[PDB]
């Protein structure tokens, strides 16, 4: 009949281990439970849903008194392994579960020693909820907590305490996107409430930007740099409007990509997002100015007339400021003079057209410096 059989009988038999009574010799004795967390693998961190998945080993070690025996009558066995369904448990569970299930499944054995010590280390995979800060999206460091509190009990019955100030990580399989900085833990008890005891561990994780710094930022920088080339195209080519609209769409493509990674923001817009709106506003201003320049270029003396102030401010003052500079003989005579006069008139109106074109060219260069200087000040700010 072995010896373990008599041990388990005398433990969970006629002595009638009740399984639902808190172990307490007196009416005021408090059961002290010592906790210790061992991180094993940081599975993933989801910014869109703000849910972190972890693989942790939580060890709980209280001290019972009904499970004790003399290690001489029952051969020489002093360590047992009782299933976690016939022994009282403190019922310590996670209090910030993402889905909202304050329940756990018990199938792992205990380890009961001879003097009453009880060790329980159940495997668990947790999906907690934590705040995600995305001010600097590629280079960010997060702070996500784990909160462990009792479920069926409160204070004046249990004394949840910390074994080690940190959470030992001596099983870690290193991740590929996040780096562990520190894992401290603290025990909070509210003096304004005699029925509140808490133990919490918080994870500080720093990202490793190499994938995003290559698949983003740099293409955005190139597309932004492409936005200043429109102010250099000639008006006769007739592709200015083709260039402006295409740049806006390309910037739209990147904005959709970024907004599908960060969660719906409330007040902390990422710094890589505020840049794109500024660039889009500048590009829209560029489109409007390009339309105005195109209208100015296509002018003729038969439809428009140049005001005297235009030829004084836009032709002789501004260009110096932008560093730029520029019997039948009677009938025969009548007809040839008519031809000469027609040629002179054609030359005059052609010269006026050239003046209009140069005025448009001068106007175009003015906005190239404004765009350059207003762009650098916007980048300096944010």
């Amino acid at each position: 009949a072995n010896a373990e059989e008599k041990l388990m009988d005398d433990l969970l038999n006629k002595t009638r281990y009740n399984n639902l009574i808190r172990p307490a010799t007196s009416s005021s004795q408090l059961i002290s439970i010592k906790l210790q967390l061992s991180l094993a693998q940081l599975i993933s961190v989801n910014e869109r849903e703000q849910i972190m998945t972890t693989n942790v080993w939580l060890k709980q070690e209280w001290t019972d008194y009904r499970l004790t025996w003399n290690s001489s009558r029952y051969e020489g066995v002093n360590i047992l392994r009782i299933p976690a369904k016939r022994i009282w448990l403190p019922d310590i569970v996670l209090y910030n579960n993402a889905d909202g299930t304050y329940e756990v499944s018990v199938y792992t054995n205990l380890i009961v020693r001879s003097n009453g010590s009880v060790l329980w280390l159940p495997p668990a995979i947790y999906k907690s909820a934590c705040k995600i800060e995305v001010k600097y999206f590629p280079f960010d460091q997060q702070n996500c907590t784990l909160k462990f509190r009792s479920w069926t009990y409160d204070h004046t019955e249990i004394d949840m305490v910390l074994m080690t100030p940190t959470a030992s990580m001596d099983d870690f399989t290193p991740s590929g996107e996040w780096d562990i900085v520190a894992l401290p833990g603290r025990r909070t008890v509210n003096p304004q409430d005699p029925s509140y005891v808490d133990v919490t561990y918080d994870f500080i994780i720093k990202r490793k930007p190499l994938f995003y710094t290559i698949n983003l930022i740099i293409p955005c920088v190139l597309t932004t740099l492409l936005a200043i080339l429109v102010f250099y195209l000639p008006s006769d080519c007739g592709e200015k409007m083709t260039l402006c609209i295409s740049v806006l769409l390309a910037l739209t493509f990147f904005l959709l990509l970024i907004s599908k990674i960060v969660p719906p923001t409330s007040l902390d817009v990422p710094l890589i997002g505020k840049y794109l709106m500024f660039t889009m506003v500048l590009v829209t201003f560029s489109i409007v100015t390009s339309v105005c320049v195109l209208n100015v270029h296509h002018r003729s003396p038969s439809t428009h007339t140049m005001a005297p102030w235009v030829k004084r401010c836009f032709l002789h003052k501004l260009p110096t400021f932008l560093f730029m500079k520029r019997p039948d003989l009677a009938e025969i005579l009548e007809e040839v003079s008519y031809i000469a006069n027609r040629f002179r008139n054609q030359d005059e109106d052609q010269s006026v057209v050239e003046d209009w074109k140069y005025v448009a060219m001068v106007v175009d260069r003015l906005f190239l410096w404004v765009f350059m200087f207003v762009c650098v000040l916007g980048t300096v700010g944010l």
């Binding site: 009574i21 200015k240 719906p264 829209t284 339309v291 209208n295 038969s302 439809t303 007809e335």
Partner: protein, 387 residues
């Protein structure tokens, strides 16, 4: 063990199928109160709100009581919830899954029979959505609680306080709760005969516009204001339809997105889904003008003739009101030269008509530019007047 003896004596002869009332034809009082923990999400496409709550029941009992003196001064026990009678309070307006709440947390007996039960519960209720002003809206969703089988003469439901207990709330990021009041009513259903009581808790969440303004409304204004730019482009530039097509495609994409972000209810018209329809209508009407004004620019004296009714209207009358006021051997040599002169004169005469056609096209473009600016400035102050 004193506690074991008390537990054995209390539950020696007990069944949970009988009401805890002592004398028959008497109602057992049940005090009810909920408390919110976290509002997960408020879906708008399906009109479903999911919430995490903590129901609280405090009722009475007569057979679960004992004298503390006879024992070691015990005035509190913890029994499983699957061994005592519990009222059946359900969520009337469920949307998915089952109706019965998740109850496994142990009760809390007192020495005078005062049971307390606080089980967790996850609810996915259904409430109609109001999209008259899709941004800056105020939703009003309610939760209904009541006993399914016990009538008003048996369970006699009561309420504690008048507000949902918000002390452990985990604050959200997109919605703000400003009112969580609750009231009690009595109903008499058609299928039943007796009166039945309810307790309804209604939320008054308010949206926080940061995502649906800078990413939905602000980019739309640029497209809306970029439609008028077409009428300032010269006809000879060669890019008068790329702008119109781009604007139309952008508006189409915007319509598609807003349609696939809003519930399909057809009781009221949103103030953005009709504004964007109006903008699309006037964008479509803008392309028609451009084609009808690009055609008048390329007319030639040898293909079309300008009638007098156009000359007296589009050339002299209309431009004044637009501040665009109108701005042997010698014989053969003579024979040859005269021919050259007449050719030049004919060329000049044709060029005059071509220039007149171009000016008429310009006048039409300016008139439509003014009309579109005047209308579009009004538009915004109307469909988007009070959002």
């Amino acid at each position: 063990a004193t506690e074991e003896r008390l537990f054995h004596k209390l539950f020696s002869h007990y069944n949970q199928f009988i009401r805890p009332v002592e004398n028959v034809s008497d109602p057992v009082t049940v005090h009810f109160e909920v408390a919110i923990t976290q509002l997960a999400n408020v879906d708008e496409v399906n009109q479903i709100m999911e919430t995490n709550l903590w129901l609280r029941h405090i009722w009475n009992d007569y057979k679960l009581r004992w004298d503390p003196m006879e024992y070691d001064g015990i005035e509190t026990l913890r029994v499983p919830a699957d061994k005592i009678w519990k009222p059946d309070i359900v969520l009337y307006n469920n949307a998915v899954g089952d109706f019965q709440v998740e109850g496994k947390t142990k009760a809390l007996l007192k020495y005078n029979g005062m049971i307390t039960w606080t089980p967790p519960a996850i609810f996915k209720s259904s409430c109609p959505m109001d999209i008259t002003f899709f941004p800056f809206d105020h939703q009003n969703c309610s939760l209904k609680f009541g006993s399914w089988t016990y009538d008003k003469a048996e369970i006699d439901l009561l309420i504690i306080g008048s507000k949902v207990d918000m002390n452990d709330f985990w604050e959200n990021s997109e919605w703000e709760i400003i009112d969580a009041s609750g009231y009690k009513h009595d109903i008499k259903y058609n299928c039943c005969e007796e009166i039945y009581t309810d307790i309804t808790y209604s939320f008054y969440i308010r949206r926080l516009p940061m995502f649906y303004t800078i990413n939905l409304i602000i980019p739309c204004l640029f497209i809306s204001f970029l439609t008028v730019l077409v009428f300032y482009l010269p006809s000879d530039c060669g890019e008068k339809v790329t702008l119109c097509i781009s604007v139309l495609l952008s508006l189409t994409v915007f319509l598609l997105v807003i349609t696939e972000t809003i519930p399909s209810t057809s009781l009221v018209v949103p103030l953005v889904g009709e504004y964007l329809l109006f903008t699309m209508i006037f964008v479509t009407l803008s392309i028609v003008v451009t084609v009808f004004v690009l055609n008048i620019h390329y007319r030639t004296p040898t293909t079309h003739t300008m009638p007098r009714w156009v000359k007296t209207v589009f050339l002299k009358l209309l431009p004044q009101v637009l501040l665009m006021r109108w701005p042997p051997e010698l014989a053969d040599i003579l024979n040859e030269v005269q021919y050259i002169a007449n050719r030049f004169r004919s060329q000049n005469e044709t060029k005059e008509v071509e220039d007149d056609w171009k000016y008429v096209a310009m006048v039409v473009d300016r008139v439509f530019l003014w009309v579109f600016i005047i209308v579009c400035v009004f538009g915004t102050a109307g469909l988007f007047l009070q959002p």
